[PDB]
């Protein structure tokens, strides 16, 4: 069916090669998975060697890393804002790698208020010895603290959910965040 070969392709000199051999399965290609947002629908796939690929199609509950805090949570995936390759992916809220989105904030909220004892941008003397110790690392970026009021937080993808079946990524921080923020106020 599909091919990834370069024999169908023209030459460096613009030249046209012949049909040297018929299509072969070891050069095959497969049609994509325009992974949407919905109930967990995943179709497993036999790849070469009997190794398995896992085509996601409809997802919530993505596993997202928070880098500065160095933790990782599972989050009700909200929606889509920006994609560099095609804006159609935002138009359909379709998921790939590099497929920026918003997500729930409440898990990270409660983690923060649990660990540091604080609140998000508004006893048990052992717990107090914990909270005071964690104090002065309990500060964060004002901009990221902003979205906590809104309850919806920006993140990026690190997976290929059309391969893994998983939708995993990480909350934005730093100057990458600032870049995509300039992009946010520029595009939206």
């Amino acid at each position: 069916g599909i091919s990834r070969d370069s024999r169908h392709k023209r030459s460096a000199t613009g030249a046209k090669r012949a049909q040297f051999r018929k299509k072969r399965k070891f050069e095959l290609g497969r049609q994509p998975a325009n992974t949407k947002i919905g109930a967990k629908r995943i179709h497993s796939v036999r790849t070469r060697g009997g190794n398995k690929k896992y085509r996601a199609l409809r997802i919530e509950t993505g596993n997202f890393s928070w880098a500065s805090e160095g933790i990782s949570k599972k989050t009700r995936i909200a929606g889509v804002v920006y994609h560099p390759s095609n804006n159609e992916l935002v138009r359909t809220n379709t998921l790939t790698k590099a497929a920026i989105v918003q997500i729930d904030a409440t898990p990270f909220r409660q983690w923060f208020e649990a660990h540091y004892g604080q609140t998000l941008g508004k006893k048990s003397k052992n717990a107090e010895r914990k909270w005071a110790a964690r104090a002065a690392s309990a500060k964060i970026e004002s901009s990221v603290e902003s979205q906590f009021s809104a309850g919806r937080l920006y993140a990026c993808i690190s997976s290929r959910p059309g391969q893994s079946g998983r939708c995993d990524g990480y909350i934005l921080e730093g100057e990458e965040l600032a870049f995509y923020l300039r992009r946010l106020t520029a595009k939206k």
Partner: protein
């Protein structure tokens, strides 16, 4: 041609898995990753003090140089972050027992740690096909005239 302004493109071009924790304060503004490629090839300062990205540069990138190492002259400096090198050579005919001039052109990728042009006789090494013709990446570059 030139060097860009790093995040000119639609996507935040960066070094993957290279995290610079903003909670941590520092005098440096970015954790830069680089490397030696080996074979005594000397990594330039520009890789390490620069801000350009170029994943396909053997320095500060994710290719790995190994295989053949060639040299050749530069003839085309047009495209973005890739050039063409001419390899002149000879071919022996026993019948007449003589040689003749042949040549072959080698499209390669170039780093924006180098800054080059026509002339500029090259050191270049094999780098695990990059895009459809380009199997070679610059490693070191010579001056031409002075």
């Amino acid at each position: 041609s030139t060097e860009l302004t790093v995040q000119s493109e639609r996507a935040f071009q960066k070094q993957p898995h290279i995290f610079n924790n903003p909670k941590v304060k520092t005098s440096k503004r970015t954790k830069r990753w680089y490397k030696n490629a080996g074979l005594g090839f000397k990594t330039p300062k520009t890789a390490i003090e620069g801000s350009y990205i170029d994943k396909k540069c053997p320095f500060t990138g994710l290719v790995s140089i190994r295989g053949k190492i060639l040299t050749g002259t530069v003839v085309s400096t047009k495209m973005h972050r890739t050039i063409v090198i001419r390899r002149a050579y000879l071919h022996y005919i026993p019948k007449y027992n003589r040689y003749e001039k042949r040549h072959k052109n080698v499209p390669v990728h170039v780093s924006p740690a180098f800054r080059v042009q026509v002339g500029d006789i090259v050191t270049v090494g094999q780098c695990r096909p990059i895009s459809k013709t380009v199997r070679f990446n610059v490693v070191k570059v010579s001056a031409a005239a002075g």
